[PDB]
C-alpha cells in the first residue's frame, strides 16, 4: 500500500524536485499533484464519495485562484476534511506567514531550503516524521 | 532562549521519563509542566498579559478535569492560543483517537512506546522535527 502524498504546488520544477526527492525517501510513497487550491478541493471532493484520501497534504502559500491560506481555511471548515494533516511547504520564512498558517490550523510549516542537498534532506525528514515517527489518520 | 516545551501531565513517572529523554536529546529544551488542561489554560492566560508562550504543547488524552480533546477544543477556540503547536502524546494507538485529535486540530499525534530505547528515540525525533526541521511560531 503506498502512502499517498497530495502536493499542492503551481511551479512544475517544485513538483519535479518533490517526485525526485520522494524516490530517495525509502518510505513507499505515491505523489498526487494539484496545481492550486481549487484542484486540491476538487480532488478531495472525489475522495469523500469515492476511494482513498491522501495520507498527507503539502501546500504552497502563493498559488493562483485558491492560495494556501484559502486552502487551509477550506480544509478546516469542511468536517470531512478537517482531520487531513496539512503542511505548508513554501519559500517564505516570514514569521507572519508561519503564525497565520498555524492560526488557520496547518499541522506544520516547512521552508523550502536554499540548496538542493538541504531540500533532499528536508523531504527525507518530513517523510521519516509524518510516515514513521508520527501517527496520522488512517485512509480506511 | 531555550525552546520551551509545555507538558500537560499529572503522572510523576511520565514527567521523570520526559525529563530523562530531553536530557539525551541533542536540542536545548526547557520543560514547563501543567498538571491538567485547566492549569495549562491558566498558564497560557498569564502568557498573554505576562511573559513568553511555549514553543510547543504536549498533552495526553486522559487527564483529570480538562481532557486532551477538551484542551485542543479550548486552544483552537481562543484566537490568542489557536496558533500554538499542540501534540498529543498518549499510549492509545486507537485510530478513532488519532482521527479525532487531528479533527480537533492537534498539530500531531505520537504514541508513547513501551521500551525505554524507543521512547528516547521518539523524543529525539519529536524535538529534531518541531525544533529543527519545521518552522513553528516565534514566542519571544
Ligand atoms: Ca507558488
Ligand atoms: Ca483566491
Ligand atoms: Ca493546529
Ligand atoms: Ca490541522
Ligand atoms: Ca500521562
Residue numbers in the entry:
A (entry chain A), B (entry chain B): 7 to 146
Article, verbatim:
As DrBphP and Agp1 strikingly differed in their enzymatic activity and interactions, we next asked whether these differences could be explained by the structure of the interface between the DHp and RR. To model this interface with confidence, we solved the crystal structure of the response regulator from D. radiodurans (DrRR) at 2.1 Å resolution. The protein, which consists only of a receiver (REC) domain, crystallized in the tetragonal P41212 space group with four monomers in the asymmetric unit. Overall, the structure of the DrRR is highly similar to other reported response regulators. It contains the structural features and the conserved residues critical for its receiver function in two-component signaling. Notably, the crystal structure of DrRR contained Ca2+ instead of Mg2+ ions found in other response regulator structures. The Ca2+ ions played a central role in this crystal form, as their replacement with Mg2+ did not allow crystal formation. Although Ca2+ is chemically similar to Mg2+, its larger size leads to diffuse coordination of the ion in the active sites and 45% higher B-factors compared to Mg2+ ions modeled at the same sites. In each case, the Ca2+ ions are hexagonally coordinated to surrounding atoms, which involve water molecules, the side chains of Glu15, Asp16, Asn17, the phospho-accepting Asp66, and the main-chain oxygen of Asn68. Given its presence in the DrRR crystal structure, we tested the effects of Ca2+ in the DrBphP activity and DrRR binding. We discovered that although the DrBphP/DrRR interaction was slightly stronger in the presence of Ca2+, the DrBphP enzymatic activity was lost.
